[PDB]
């Protein structure tokens, strides 16, 4: 059955969006809307192996106390973003493995939804063959270790419908043990329509023994900006998409989620914009305004 059905997704009470909505003077309808919508909580190399267990236990326990399903995104892979606007990740595979162990320790047997490494498999060809193999091994390690929490619904990130082909991505998913996870994620931090992503997801599902998927609908209400380089990097004219739900239109689509947090910058984007991940109230307002709110 769909592990995501049956309770609301957790609204993070401490998100930058909540802080902005509470501080708004006068109150702002767009910030409030965004702030009250459940998103995902992103963890990376700022949360070292030594302590991330406690961070995870705290967040999943808080979500359980709220009667809700926490969504956590892991974004610590070595050579992350191939050193572009969202550069970072742990220094080595050894560090990354210790990080995954600590995250798993914090999960215990608690309910959680885990999005594993946005872009990692899709971007892997920027690496040398040896480094690419290591990356696949690390994503497979995440799957094998995290799924030891029976109550973790694990979705390995699989890019989007205009990145790798369904066949190419399915090969990579099968290589990293997608069969042990619940499935895969699509459209993370991107803008493609839900319909387009459903067709792509059902194709990958067909090639991965019926695996299930989630789609990031945080910013896809108006589809993507015109085809261009960096059309994914703080594009204007985009809108909030469907709020998180399990009432989807795909046979193997477990949920629409907001994985990316609306309002956060995608990077400097060659325009001196705020660093990737920094909350920009104006960006959240624009996305909400464009959706008619």
Ligand X SMILES: OC[C@H]1O[C@@H](O[C@H]2[C@H](O)[C@@H](O)[C@H](O)O[C@@H]2CO)[C@H](O)[C@@H](O)[C@@H]1O
Active site residues: 81, 119, 266
Closer Cβ to ligand X, 30 or 157, answer by number:
157
Separation CA 47–CA 58 (nearest Å):
13
Closer Cβ to ligand X, 30 or 81, answer by number:
81
Separation CA 204–CA 87 (nearest Å):
28
| Interacting positions 75-104 with ligand X (CB under 6 A) | 81, 84-86
Q: List the one residue out of 82, 114, 96 whose CA is nearest residue 44.
A: 96
Closer Cβ to ligand X, 85 or 200, answer by number:
85
Q: How many residues bind ligand X (CB under 6 A)?
A: 12
Q: Are 184 and 170 within 8 A, CB to CB?
A: no
| Placement of tokens 């501080």 in the chain | 23
| Interacting positions 112-131 with ligand X (CB under 6 A) | 119, 123
| Residue 138 engages ligand X in binding (rule: CB under 6 A) | no
Phi, psi of 206 (to 5 degrees): -60, -30
Closer Cβ to ligand X, 53 or 235, answer by number:
235
User: For ligand X, which residue of 9, 10, 163, 283 counts as binding (CB under 6 A)?
Assistant: 163
| Residue 180 engages ligand X in binding (rule: CB under 6 A) | no
User: For ligand X, which residue of 37, 45, 190, 205 counts as binding (CB under 6 A)?
Assistant: 190
Nearest distance, CB of residue 231 and ligand X, angstroms: 8
Nearest distance, CB of residue 75 and ligand X, angstroms: 9
Nearest distance, CB of residue 216 and ligand X, angstroms: 9
Q: For residue 20, what are its two tokens?
A: 């902005």
CA of residue 80 relative to chain centroid, distance = 14
Q: Classify each residue of 52-89 as buried b or exposed e, where b means 16 or more C-beta atoms within 10 Å of its C-beta.
A: bbebbbebbeebbeeebbbbbbbbbbbbbbeeebbebb
Closer Cβ to ligand X, 160 or 172, answer by number:
160
| Residue 189 engages ligand X in binding (rule: CB under 6 A) | yes
∠ CA 173-175-180, rounded to 5°: 70
Closer Cβ to ligand X, 58 or 278, answer by number:
278
Q: For residue 203, what are its two tokens?
A: 């194709």
Q: Are 151 and 111 within 8 A, CB to CB?
A: yes
Q: Are 159 and 186 within 8 A, CB to CB?
A: yes
Q: List the one residue out of 93, 95, 180, 184 whose CA is nearest residue 145.
A: 180
Nearest distance, CB of residue 227 and ligand X, angstroms: 9
User: For ligand X, which residue of 9, 10, 75, 232 counts as binding (CB under 6 A)?
Assistant: 232
Nearest distance, CB of residue 266 and ligand X, angstroms: 7
Nearest distance, CB of residue 6 and ligand X, angstroms: 30
Q: Which residues pair with 184 in a beta bridge?
A: 156, 213
Binding site for ligand X (CB under 6 A): 81, 84-86, 119, 123, 160, 162-163, 189-190, 232
């Amino acid at each position: 059955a769909n592990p995501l059905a049956g309770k609301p997704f957790y609204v993070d009470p401490a998100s930058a969006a909540m802080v902005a909505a509470r501080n708004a003077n006068p109150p702002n309808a767009e910030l409030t809307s965004v702030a009250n919508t459940p998103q995902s909580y992103w963890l990376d190399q700022a949360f070292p192996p030594a302590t991330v267990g406690g961070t995870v236990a705290r967040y999943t326990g808080a979500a359980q106390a709220a009667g809700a399903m926490p969504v956590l995104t892991l974004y610590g892979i070595p050579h992350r973003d191939c050193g572009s606007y969202a550069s970072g990740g742990f220094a080595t595979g050894t560090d990354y493995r210790g990080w995954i162990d600590a995250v798993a320790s914090g999960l215990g047997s608690s309910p959680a939804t885990i999005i594993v490494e946005p872009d990692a498999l899709a971007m892997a060809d920027c690496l040398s063959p040896d480094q690419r193999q290591e990356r696949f091994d690390l994503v497979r390690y995440a799957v094998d270790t995290l799924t030891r929490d029976p109550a973790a619904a694990v979705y390995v990130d699989a890019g989007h419908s205009r990145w790798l082909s369904a066949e190419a991505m399915a090969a990579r998913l099968n290589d990293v043990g997608v069969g042990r996870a619940r499935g895969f994620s699509l459209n993370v931090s991107n803008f493609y329509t839900t319909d387009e992503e459903i067709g792509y997801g059902e194709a990958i599902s067909g090639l991965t023994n019926g695996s299930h998927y989630v789609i990031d609908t945080s910013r896809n209400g108006a589809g993507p900006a015109p085809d261009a380089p960096l059309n994914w990097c703080n594009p204007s004219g985009r809108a909030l998409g469907a709020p998180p739900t399990t009432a989807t239109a795909g046979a193997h689509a477990d949920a629409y989620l907001w994985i990316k947090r609306p309002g956060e910058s995608d990077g400097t984007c060659g325009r001196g914009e705020p660093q990737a991940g920094r909350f920009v109230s104006q960006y959240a307002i624009d996305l909400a305004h464009n959706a008619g709110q």
